[PDB]
Design a protein around this ligand. Structure first.
Ligand code: HEM
Ligand code: HEM
Ligand code: 9CL
Ligand code: 9CL
Lengths: 145, 145
């Protein structure tokens, strides 16, 4: 279950998540747009899903993409803040899962975000250990998809 | 005009928003659910829109309502963090406006949240001064609906 995937996030994993988020989450606009542009660059097949955002190749200049990207970072802020209470983490994860289920995003497709996360983490010198930690948090969402 | 509405957030208004948010934003789960339960209690005609959440009279005990309420508080956190840059504030406000336009929520009905906000603020010893400041931020969203 989602609870099982969440309840498994250990003290060490939570530490790495919080330490990396302190840095990446400090610039939500910059890193949020970077995450999305990287997703579109490495997984061009996902571009069609974001038709509401217009021309995503516009990057930062695209107000709709910017608004979406900043908001996405607060979804992650939400997750990070709920780490010590699995019950709260689960209910917020399920809420966001619905937002993606309605768009027909499968657990496998959601996992495509791991590549971009790893790259942005590397841009701030956070290695594989950190990418693995984030993959575990992403896996909690996947349990709900 | 969302841009003219954003221009109404003067130095004094921004300060009041930040000062009150420091207190109420410190307990997103508690105050978020309080805001929702108050909305449903004083404006029963809006409950129909929240069909997905199930039995909202259960309050904190309802997992979907709790997840929704916590997330709503991060939408407000987002707005507060964008106060320095009107261009970014506008793009995130328009993003959330779409979430409500799709639910058939008009500017007039969105405005029904002002009552609950004033009541919750009052219970924390924040008077009309603060309620009016928040009404100005809510007005920015209304301009986009
Ligand atoms: C860290 C992972 C991710 C997070 C935290 C996240 C967060 C969000 C948020 C907060 C929204 C707005 C929901 C709404 O207002 O309805 C959104 C929308 C969306 N997401 Fe994600 N997302 C993630 C990964 C993905 C991935 C990998 C895909 C696709 C392969 C995806 C596809 C979508 C689509 C299509 C939308 C709708 C965009 C629109 O039309 O506004 N998401 N996401
Ligand atoms: C401070 C004011 C408000 C804020 C910041 C706010 C924020 C939000 C957020 C973040 C969501 C989730 C969006 C999504 O995932 O699609 C949401 C959903 C929703 N909001 Fe609001 N909202 C506010 C006031 C209102 C009011 C006054 C109404 C109705 C009179 C309203 C009706 C809805 C409805 C029907 C949903 C969909 C719930 C669901 O089915 O999951 N909102 N709101
Ligand atoms: Cl700190 C992990 C991360 C989150 C969002 C974007 C890029 C990296
Ligand atoms: Cl600080 C303005 C506020 C936000 C949420 C609930 C009550 C008041």
């Amino acid at each position: 279950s989602v609870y099982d995937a969440a309840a498994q996030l250990t003290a060490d994993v939570k530490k790495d998540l919080r330490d990396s988020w302190k840095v990446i989450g400090s610039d939500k606009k910059g890193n949020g747009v970077a995450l999305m542009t990287t997703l579109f660059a490495d997984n061009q097949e996902t571009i069609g899903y974001f038709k509401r955002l217009g021309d995503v190749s516009q990057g930062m200049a695209n107000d709709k993409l910017r608004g979406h990207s900043i908001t996405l970072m607060y979804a992650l802020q939400n997750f990070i803040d709920q780490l010590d209470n699995p019950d709260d983490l689960v209910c917020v994860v399920e809420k966001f899962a619905v937002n993606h289920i309605t768009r027909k995003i499968s657990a496998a497709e959601f996992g495509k975000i791991n590549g971009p996360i790893k790259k942005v983490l590397a841009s701030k010198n956070f290695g594989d250990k950190y990418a693995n930690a984030w993959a575990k948090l992403v896996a909690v969402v996947q349990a709900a998809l």
